[PDB]
Amino acid sequence: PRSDEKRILSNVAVLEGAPPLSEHWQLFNNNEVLFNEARTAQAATVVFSLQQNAQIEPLARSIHTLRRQRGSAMKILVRENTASLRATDERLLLACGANMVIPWNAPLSRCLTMIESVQGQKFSRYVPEDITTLLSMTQPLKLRGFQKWDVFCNAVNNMMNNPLLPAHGKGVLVALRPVPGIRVEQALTLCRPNRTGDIMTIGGNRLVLFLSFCRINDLDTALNHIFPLPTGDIFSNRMVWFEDDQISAELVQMRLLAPEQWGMPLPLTRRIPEPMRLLD
Amino acid sequence: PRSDEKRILSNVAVLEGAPPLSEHWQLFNNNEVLFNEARTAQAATVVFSLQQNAQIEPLARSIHTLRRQRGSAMKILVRENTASLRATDERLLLACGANMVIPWNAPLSRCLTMIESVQGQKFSRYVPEDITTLLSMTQPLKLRGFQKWDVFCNAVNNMMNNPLLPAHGKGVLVALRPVPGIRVEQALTLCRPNRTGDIMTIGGNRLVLFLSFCRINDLDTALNHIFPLPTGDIFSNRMVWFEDDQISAELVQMRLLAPEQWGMPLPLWRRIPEPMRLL
Amino acid sequence: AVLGLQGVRGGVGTTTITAALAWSLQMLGENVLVVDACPDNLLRLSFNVDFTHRQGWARAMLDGQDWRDAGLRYTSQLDLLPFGQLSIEEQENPQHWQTRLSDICSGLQQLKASGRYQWILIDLPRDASQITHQLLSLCDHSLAIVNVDANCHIELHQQALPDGAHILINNFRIGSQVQDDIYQLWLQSQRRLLPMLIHRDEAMAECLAAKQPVGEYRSDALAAEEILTLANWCLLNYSGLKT
Amino acid sequence: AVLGLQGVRGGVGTTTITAALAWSLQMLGENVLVVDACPDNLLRLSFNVDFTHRQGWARAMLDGQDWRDAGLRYTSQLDLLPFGQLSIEEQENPQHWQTRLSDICSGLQQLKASGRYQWILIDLPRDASQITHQLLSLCDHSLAIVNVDANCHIELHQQALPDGAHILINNFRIGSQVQDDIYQLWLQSQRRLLPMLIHRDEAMAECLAAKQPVGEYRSDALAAEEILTLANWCLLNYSGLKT
Amino acid sequence: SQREQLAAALKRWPLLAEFAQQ
Amino acid sequence: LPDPAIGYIFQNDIVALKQAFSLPDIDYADISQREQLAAALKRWPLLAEFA
């Protein structure tokens, strides 16, 4: 049984229009046909193409299947052909069984060198049998919008203490003090979060919100996505916590606030007008 | 009767979701695979499905090569599953060797009755060996819009003397006299035809249209698609010729028109307004 | 034949439609004159008149000068009569000058009898000013410009318009469900509606920016062809005078 | 404070925005009164007022009645004061009633000094009448509603804006060359522009048909959230009472 | 089906019904 | 007479001549928002009329 170690099963997009570089290259129209061919391989190199965010979950399933069912001899790469990708997606693909994710800003030259770099490499990391463990760590919070002060602290602390996520880059905790011209519940209507990982709460005349997987150097750009008006105009003071030890300590201090100091949104998140006399 | 005289090779769209009606019915996913199977039949019934006007030319090919090669015992029907279809396209399909074209407005019951009515028919009509002859049979004159009077007369005359077009129904010739309130050149601006083969001309205080392959019944429907306003409000009197002798007769009268009575459309960095004084 | 075009509501497109209808009528070979009865004085800008050019018929009268000397010729068959640029005091105090200008109504009676023009279009503003009612009584026929919206629907049920006037839909969009419901209801309820409408066309938004009528700026634009149809409809239905 | 809203021309969307901003302020928990100063009396119809209901502050004054009894309560914190239905004779003869409505100024400043309402919104029309000039003078701040077109671009140069006013953009289509060119010229020439604008949204056209403010009709609509952003901007910039 | 579509349009928009039911 | 925070006009008196001074023309628009504004002015005469 001659070995297929020199075989290269790649998505055609990986070569950027270049011809097949050797007699070992086998190109495929999409990741599905590539996956279907790789299921009978052993020590071949498989190179997927990651072009849109919609492919992330299907790609993780394909890598996971190949890593589980075909062993550690196979070398699995993901070639990024796009820049609009979350950095947590690279860790997901590497956790499902990929040896290496090739960044979009690496030219074909660097890409080919990296394909050669993983030759002879035996997979050593552990991969679970159920992918739902790995997929649920893409969305750890599974919450979005306003949450009660007790629910906010409980939910953010459970993700904070969750063991499967690593430290560093865990998120950002922001405490915003409103300008006297506006009230807290009023400014809450301005904070409109899009991502299904970001939650807010109000209490103690402070609007605090947590952003999942946010680097501190990208906090201000994340606020521009959540506030229509500049944050400096809405709020006078800003206190930030990005490292785990400071975030968990701030959550312990936030627990020491009586429920009477907590906040709730305005009662409005066919009518019939009735006559009345004004100014009486 | 032959062996496969009771066989029905039909497109699946013909049954409109119903199960296969008998052991004789065999369904197919499209017309090409169906035509491939129909090349072996001797007296089977073949029911194509017509869903896009783009399919007219390739369908006419399959029907033509089927009828020529496979003979007169075979029965070939075309079931319309789309109302988007001109009346001259039915003439073309029948001319290529189809026994019958099932119109889109006939329900499934009517469609099945018409498939059975074709049983026992021997194809008698003559089909030419070249398909270029049949495809040219439905080509209108390749003009559209306003034409100068003599150019209009030459175009319609050369179309009436085209031996490749069939005998009757070559089009309608309309002469319209405008309401006293509006001039012929002005009424011309309302005449806006979309189809290639619809031409118009002005001459002797008359707007004259030729609508290629238009039936005398469809005259008002086609006129409503040419003019934005009702033709009764634009033109007081109307003259119509829809048969070959009538059109060709009116053309020999039109040719007598003097060139001085021929009309033409109205004529109409930036313009600058010039000061003036009123009165 | 003096035709008055007026909006049911402000901003529905009267100025752009009168300029286009004027171009379409002169293109059909009719002698046309267009007067601007709006203090905004926007009609002149559709005919490449410099914004700094303050002359006009209303400005000539209020300055003591002759109104006939304020005319401008666009083509051999299209004559233009701007309103004139008002002062800031005159904009803020419309009552002082509102009734000093009934001479133009007598002067239009001369032109209507002069026979020089087969059509005299009047760009009428959406107000109940005296000059506007005086000018409206001179017109032999009248058009009312609307947009298919709830604002115009309400105005059509509470605001009276001249007798015999017809309704011209402008800025007709595609895809709007509420517009489809109002329009479908209008087609069966509105009896004064015209048999043609004017779609929303980028050419109508660009022609004013290009200082040209929409029939000249882009003759093959859909609105240009719909206004041209309107011009022929005016020749067919709005040719007879009012006693 | 007392905030007036006035379009630079008609049809720009002043009434619909005035109703939506009032609803957004009452949603923020502020006692707001919204008064209709347009003789069209169209603001009442955004609050499910039956169209036959003729009562209004101007209707009361001309009939010699108390204008305070013409008020209507929509929610606990939103009150409205309609203009009143004028008869056909009254609307076509504005000279008869314009100078007979100055009593609303004294009553407005009394209502102002009362302290019941934290915001008083006034829907101002485009006319330069004596009453509208008086009501505009009693305002603390004002918004000039525009649409990005060649019409408003001309007016913005030939029409004086109130002092300290801010320009609000409505009916913002994306995908129009002339609109984007006029916009990019406004971004570097108009210092009075707001940091937000109201996109063209089908909800703004449907809400008036439903006789509701757009915030109550669809709180998820882009225009509804954009006007909610306007309310918060008003709280941060327009709450002072400049004397 | 045109009689049906008008009925639904009146039910959808109270402003239209208000003027048609007078 | 000009803006005193932008310019100044001098009078010669000996010879009937006026020399006007102004601050240098400096524009800090982005390299794209200035490029497209010039194209927009070239495209529409109505926009260029108010420049």
Ligand SMILES: Nc1nc2c(ncn2[C@@H]2O[C@@H]3COP(=O)(O)O[C@H]4[C@@H](O)[C@H](n5cnc6c(=O)[nH]c(N)nc65)O[C@@H]4COP(=O)(O)O[C@H]3[C@H]2O)c(=O)[nH]1
């Ligand atoms: N500029 C910017 N906008 C952001 C960002 N995060 C969220 N948004 C905005 O918020 C919308 C909803 O985000 P979501 O709930 O995470 O919902 C997202 C998410 O579940 C998924 N998705 C989209 N792009 C990515 C990606 O690069 N990585 C991953 N892992 N998921 C993605 O698809 C959903 C729909 O996405 P969209 O239609 O694009 O719409 C996104 C986008 O308009 C960000 O970091 N930058």
Ligand SMILES: Nc1nc2c(ncn2[C@@H]2O[C@@H]3COP(=O)(O)O[C@H]4[C@@H](O)[C@H](n5cnc6c(=O)[nH]c(N)nc65)O[C@@H]4COP(=O)(O)O[C@H]3[C@H]2O)c(=O)[nH]1
């Ligand atoms: N929690 C939270 N964080 C936010 C939000 N907006 C921005 N960030 C943070 O800011 C980083 C850079 O954002 P960007 O410039 O929009 O740059 C983003 C954006 O261009 C694109 N992208 C990522 N996710 C989405 C998405 O869901 N939709 C769209 N349309 N683009 C996305 O990929 C780039 C890199 O994304 P990341 O690595 O995830 O990195 C993001 C993320 O860490 C937000 O709404 N919520």
Ligand SMILES: Nc1nc2c(ncn2[C@@H]2O[C@@H]3COP(=O)(O)O[C@H]4[C@@H](O)[C@H](n5cnc6c(=O)[nH]c(N)nc65)O[C@@H]4COP(=O)(O)O[C@H]3[C@H]2O)c(=O)[nH]1
């Ligand atoms: N002279 C003239 N008559 C016109 C024109 N448009 C419509 N008619 C007449 O009006 C009938 C019904 O029009 P339809 O609903 O558009 O119905 C059409 C339309 O829906 C579609 N169709 C046919 N030919 C074309 C074409 O060239 N382009 C497009 N886009 N659709 C077509 O298939 C249907 C079949 O049309 P017919 O059976 O011939 O039946 C047509 C035809 O007799 C026109 O521009 N000129």
Ligand SMILES: Nc1nc2c(ncn2[C@@H]2O[C@@H]3COP(=O)(O)O[C@H]4[C@@H](O)[C@H](n5cnc6c(=O)[nH]c(N)nc65)O[C@@H]4COP(=O)(O)O[C@H]3[C@H]2O)c(=O)[nH]1
């Ligand atoms: N709805 C409708 N529109 C009509 C009709 N007749 C003309 N038009 C419009 O006018 C365009 C030019 O038509 P043409 O010169 O006959 O040019 C047509 C014609 O030569 C041919 N064609 C299209 N549909 C049919 C059809 O149903 N039957 C036949 N025999 N030819 C068709 O393809 C050309 C291109 O067609 P289109 O792109 O559709 O473009 C058509 C369509 O937009 C009609 O009956 N109904």
Ligand SMILES: Nc1ncnc2c1ncn2[C@@H]1O[C@H](COP(=O)(O)OP(=O)(O)OP(=O)(O)O)[C@@H](O)[C@H]1O
């Ligand atoms: N059908 C249309 N499609 C696109 N834009 C249009 C259309 N009709 C008008 N417009 C544009 O909308 C604006 C309407 O302004 P216009 O002066 O023509 O209307 P109006 O009713 O006379 O307004 P007003 O008299 O109150 O100033 C212009 O910018 C015009 O170019």
Ligand SMILES: Nc1ncnc2c1ncn2[C@@H]1O[C@H](COP(=O)(O)OP(=O)(O)OP(=O)(O)O)[C@@H](O)[C@H]1O
């Ligand atoms: N952003 C928008 N999107 C869609 N439709 C809108 C928008 N803004 C306004 N409209 C619609 O435009 C029409 C006119 O709006 P509105 O009545 O508010 O204008 P206006 O300035 O008060 O007019 P006028 O005072 O001259 O009557 C209405 O049908 C309204 O629904």
Ligand SMILES: [Mg+2]
């Ligand atoms: Mg105008």
Ligand SMILES: [Mg+2]
């Ligand atoms: Mg209004």
